[PDB]
Design an enzyme around this catalytic site. Structure first.
Site, PDB file in Angstrom:
ATOM      1  N   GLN A 168       8.639  -8.753  -9.307  1.00  0.00           N
ATOM      2  CA  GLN A 168       9.568  -8.036  -8.435  1.00  0.00           C
ATOM      3  C   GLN A 168      11.008  -8.079  -8.946  1.00  0.00           C
ATOM      4  O   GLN A 168      11.772  -7.144  -8.731  1.00  0.00           O
ATOM      5  CB  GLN A 168       9.500  -8.568  -7.003  1.00  0.00           C
ATOM      6  CG  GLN A 168       8.178  -8.293  -6.282  1.00  0.00           C
ATOM      7  CD  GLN A 168       7.865  -6.802  -6.124  1.00  0.00           C
ATOM      8  OE1 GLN A 168       8.747  -5.997  -5.831  1.00  0.00           O
ATOM      9  NE2 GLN A 168       6.598  -6.439  -6.312  1.00  0.00           N
TER      10      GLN A 168
ATOM     11  N   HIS B 132       1.776   3.664   3.842  1.00  0.00           N
ATOM     12  CA  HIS B 132       2.713   3.943   2.750  1.00  0.00           C
ATOM     13  C   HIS B 132       3.292   5.363   2.843  1.00  0.00           C
ATOM     14  O   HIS B 132       4.482   5.571   2.589  1.00  0.00           O
ATOM     15  CB  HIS B 132       2.045   3.728   1.386  1.00  0.00           C
ATOM     16  CG  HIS B 132       2.866   4.218   0.231  1.00  0.00           C
ATOM     17  ND1 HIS B 132       3.992   3.562  -0.216  1.00  0.00           N
ATOM     18  CD2 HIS B 132       2.736   5.315  -0.554  1.00  0.00           C
ATOM     19  CE1 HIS B 132       4.512   4.226  -1.233  1.00  0.00           C
ATOM     20  NE2 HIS B 132       3.769   5.293  -1.458  1.00  0.00           N
TER      21      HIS B 132
ATOM     22  N   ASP C  29      10.154   6.505  -2.437  1.00  0.00           N
ATOM     23  CA  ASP C  29       8.883   5.963  -2.910  1.00  0.00           C
ATOM     24  C   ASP C  29       9.048   4.523  -3.402  1.00  0.00           C
ATOM     25  O   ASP C  29       8.167   3.683  -3.213  1.00  0.00           O
ATOM     26  CB  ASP C  29       8.312   6.843  -4.022  1.00  0.00           C
ATOM     27  CG  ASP C  29       6.829   6.625  -4.239  1.00  0.00           C
ATOM     28  OD1 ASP C  29       6.153   6.106  -3.329  1.00  0.00           O
ATOM     29  OD2 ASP C  29       6.328   6.989  -5.324  1.00  0.00           O
TER      30      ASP C  29
ATOM     31  N   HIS D 196       2.199  12.791  -0.834  1.00  0.00           N
ATOM     32  CA  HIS D 196       2.399  12.343  -2.214  1.00  0.00           C
ATOM     33  C   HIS D 196       1.393  11.320  -2.730  1.00  0.00           C
ATOM     34  O   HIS D 196       1.377  11.030  -3.922  1.00  0.00           O
ATOM     35  CB  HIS D 196       3.838  11.829  -2.412  1.00  0.00           C
ATOM     36  CG  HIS D 196       4.007  10.366  -2.134  1.00  0.00           C
ATOM     37  ND1 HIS D 196       3.974   9.838  -0.860  1.00  0.00           N
ATOM     38  CD2 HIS D 196       4.208   9.318  -2.970  1.00  0.00           C
ATOM     39  CE1 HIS D 196       4.139   8.529  -0.926  1.00  0.00           C
ATOM     40  NE2 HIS D 196       4.284   8.189  -2.194  1.00  0.00           N
ATOM     41  N   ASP D 197       0.566  10.763  -1.857  1.00  0.00           N
ATOM     42  CA  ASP D 197      -0.415   9.761  -2.297  1.00  0.00           C
ATOM     43  C   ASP D 197      -1.765   9.926  -1.632  1.00  0.00           C
ATOM     44  O   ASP D 197      -2.536   8.969  -1.554  1.00  0.00           O
ATOM     45  CB  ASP D 197       0.090   8.333  -2.036  1.00  0.00           C
ATOM     46  CG  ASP D 197       0.934   7.774  -3.176  1.00  0.00           C
ATOM     47  OD1 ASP D 197       0.696   8.108  -4.355  1.00  0.00           O
ATOM     48  OD2 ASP D 197       1.841   6.970  -2.889  1.00  0.00           O
TER      49      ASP D 197
ATOM     50  N   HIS E  99      -1.661   1.797  -0.929  1.00  0.00           N
ATOM     51  CA  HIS E  99      -1.557   3.254  -0.967  1.00  0.00           C
ATOM     52  C   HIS E  99      -2.412   3.941   0.092  1.00  0.00           C
ATOM     53  O   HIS E  99      -3.211   4.819  -0.229  1.00  0.00           O
ATOM     54  CB  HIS E  99      -1.910   3.780  -2.354  1.00  0.00           C
ATOM     55  CG  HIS E  99      -0.858   3.527  -3.388  1.00  0.00           C
ATOM     56  ND1 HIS E  99      -1.065   2.706  -4.476  1.00  0.00           N
ATOM     57  CD2 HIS E  99       0.406   3.996  -3.507  1.00  0.00           C
ATOM     58  CE1 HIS E  99       0.023   2.680  -5.220  1.00  0.00           C
ATOM     59  NE2 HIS E  99       0.933   3.452  -4.654  1.00  0.00           N
TER      60      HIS E  99
ATOM     61  N   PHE F 296      10.989  -5.713 -11.949  1.00  0.00           N
ATOM     62  CA  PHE F 296      10.906  -4.395 -11.327  1.00  0.00           C
ATOM     63  C   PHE F 296      12.249  -3.933 -10.795  1.00  0.00           C
ATOM     64  O   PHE F 296      12.694  -2.830 -11.115  1.00  0.00           O
ATOM     65  CB  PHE F 296       9.878  -4.425 -10.190  1.00  0.00           C
ATOM     66  CG  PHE F 296       9.596  -3.081  -9.566  1.00  0.00           C
ATOM     67  CD1 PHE F 296       9.313  -1.968 -10.350  1.00  0.00           C
ATOM     68  CD2 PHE F 296       9.570  -2.943  -8.183  1.00  0.00           C
ATOM     69  CE1 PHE F 296       9.035  -0.729  -9.767  1.00  0.00           C
ATOM     70  CE2 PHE F 296       9.291  -1.709  -7.592  1.00  0.00           C
ATOM     71  CZ  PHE F 296       9.026  -0.602  -8.389  1.00  0.00           C
TER      72      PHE F 296
HETATM   73  C1  LIG Z   1       6.732  -3.444  -3.206  1.00  0.00           C
HETATM   74  C2  LIG Z   1       6.716  -2.113  -3.926  1.00  0.00           C
HETATM   75  O1  LIG Z   1       7.751  -1.467  -3.998  1.00  0.00           O
HETATM   76  C3  LIG Z   1       5.427  -1.607  -4.541  1.00  0.00           C
HETATM   77  C4  LIG Z   1       5.523  -0.176  -5.076  1.00  0.00           C
HETATM   78  C5  LIG Z   1       5.924  -0.168  -6.551  1.00  0.00           C
HETATM   79  C6  LIG Z   1       4.776  -0.680  -7.427  1.00  0.00           C
HETATM   80  N1  LIG Z   1       5.272  -1.444  -8.581  1.00  0.00           N
HETATM   81  C7  LIG Z   1       5.442  -0.771  -9.750  1.00  0.00           C
HETATM   82  O2  LIG Z   1       5.199   0.423  -9.832  1.00  0.00           O
HETATM   83  C8  LIG Z   1       5.907  -1.517 -10.840  1.00  0.00           C
HETATM   84  C9  LIG Z   1       6.175  -2.884 -10.695  1.00  0.00           C
HETATM   85  N2  LIG Z   1       6.619  -3.332 -11.893  1.00  0.00           N
HETATM   86  C10 LIG Z   1       6.622  -2.297 -12.759  1.00  0.00           C
HETATM   87  N3  LIG Z   1       6.192  -1.179 -12.128  1.00  0.00           N
HETATM   88  C11 LIG Z   1       6.084   0.122 -12.793  1.00  0.00           C
HETATM   89  N4  LIG Z   1       5.991  -3.526  -9.514  1.00  0.00           N
HETATM   90  C12 LIG Z   1       6.271  -4.957  -9.379  1.00  0.00           C
HETATM   91  C13 LIG Z   1       5.537  -2.778  -8.471  1.00  0.00           C
HETATM   92  O3  LIG Z   1       5.371  -3.348  -7.400  1.00  0.00           O
HETATM   93 MG   LIG Z   2       2.240   8.743  -6.051  1.00  0.00          MG
HETATM   94 ZN   LIG Z   3       3.855   6.394  -3.324  1.00  0.00          ZN
END
Ligand SMILES: CC(=O)CCCCn1c(=O)c2c(ncn2C)n(C)c1=O
Ligand SMILES: [Mg+2]
Ligand SMILES: [Zn+2]
Length: 334
Positions: free
Chosen positions: A293, A88, A242, A124-125, A84, A296
């Site tokens: 991932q 990013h 994002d 945003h961050d 972050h 996710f």
């Molecule tokens: C590689 C990427 O896209 C990181 C940004 C997203 C962060 N993130 C999550 O927020 C998340 C997650 N699993 C559940 N959540 C809510 N992962 C694997 C994640 O990278």
């Molecule tokens: Mg944010």
């Molecule tokens: Zn972000």
């Protein structure tokens, strides 16, 4: 200042001119941009985008003011944070810039709404500490007390992004009319607040509902009759951008994934030192990077981007494929 060609001082001007030919493309490599722009990707890319869309001239924004704000903003992203940081922000901004130019949304958004989205993306961050909201809540931090445990970081990002306009020669909205400033603020609030992951469900539910009752022109261009609908699309857009990492070329996504886990584990370490219950995906001793991932993408990113693709059909078709290829790749890397 004298203003360098691509906004920032670089020793590798041509190698940078090379990459910026992808400015309007999903295939832009922001890591290269960072390398060639002396680690100031956010300042570089925002300058480029703003020239590309003629936004300086449209809103009568002094270039020296724009450059001073962007450097200030960039400086308030933390270099020691793994994911972050200003890289990013530059990423999310540029993706947003592409998602705005998508053919199905042609001549839909006003210039102000464009300006807001790009400003939201960039801020945003800002001043992210490298830990989650729940960490700030558990530690009983000043921030969590100010904002009553509700979207703490996101609220902090809005406060910091706007307060920086007041640093010497940073007011990029100085020539905007009062009406416009008021309106920009609202839109930016709605968009940044929509980057809280706990808002995701409702956001996607609304976007899905929108998609079912969508109306199109003769051309394939979406018809967003009124303001309420448009900000709903803008919220989702910045949210999509994002969580766009897994939709990018595998080479990039893996580098993003490495950055996020380092950040994640670093929180976990700190959570452990303090004897706190460790947050999900933060235990380096029990975390499967590859499983995480896939979960996710399955639960969050595919449903999100699928719905977006339905909305902008068929503009996002390639993006969606890339997500599915990347999903498969991580599935087999377990
Ligand atoms: C590689 C990427 O896209 C990181 C940004 C997203 C962060 N993130 C999550 O927020 C998340 C997650 N699993 C559940 N959540 C809510 N992962 C694997 C994640 O990278
Ligand atoms: Mg944010
Ligand atoms: Zn972000």
């Amino acid at each position: 200042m004298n203003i360098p060609r691509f906004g920032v001082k670089t020793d590798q001007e041509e190698l940078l001119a090379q990459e910026l030919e992808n400015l309007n493309k999903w295939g832009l490599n922001i890591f290269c941009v960072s390398d060639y722009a002396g680690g100031r990707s956010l300042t570089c890319i925002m300058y480029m985008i703003f020239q590309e869309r003629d936004l300086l001239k449209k809103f009568r924004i002094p270039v020296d003011t724009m450059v001073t704000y962007m450097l200030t903003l960039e400086d308030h992203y933390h270099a020691d944070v793994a994911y972050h940081n200003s890289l990013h922000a530059a990423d999310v901004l540029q993706s947003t810039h592409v998602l705005l130019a998508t053919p199905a949304l042609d001549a839909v958004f006003t210039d102000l709404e464009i300006l807001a989205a790009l400003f939201a993306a960039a801020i945003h961050d800002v001043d992210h500490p490298g830990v989650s909201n729940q960490f700030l809540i558990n530690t009983n931090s000043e921030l969590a007390l100010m904002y009553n445990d509700e979207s703490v970081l996101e609220n902090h990002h809005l406060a910091v992004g706007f307060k920086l306009l007041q640093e010497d020669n940073c007011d990029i909205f100085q020539n905007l009319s009062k009406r416009q400033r008021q309106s920009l603020r609202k839109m930016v609030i709605d968009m940044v607040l929509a980057t809280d992951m706990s808002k995701h469900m409702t956001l996607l539910a609304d976007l899905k509902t929108m998609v079912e009752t969508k109306k199109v022109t003769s051309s394939g261009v979406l018809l967003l009759d009124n303001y309420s609908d448009r900000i709903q699309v803008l919220r989702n857009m910045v949210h999509c951008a994002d969580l766009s990492n897994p939709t990018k070329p595998l080479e990039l996504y893996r580098q993003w994934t490495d950055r996020i886990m380092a950040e994640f584990f670093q929180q976990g370490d700190r959570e452990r030192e303090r004897g706190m219950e460790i947050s999900p995906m933060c235990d380096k001793h029990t975390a499967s990077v590859e499983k995480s991932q896939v979960g996710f993408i399955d639960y969050i990113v595919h449903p999100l981007w699928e719905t977006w693709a339905d909305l902008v059909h068929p503009d996002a078709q390639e993006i969606l494929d890339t997500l599915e290829d990347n999903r498969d790749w991580y599935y087999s890397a377990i």
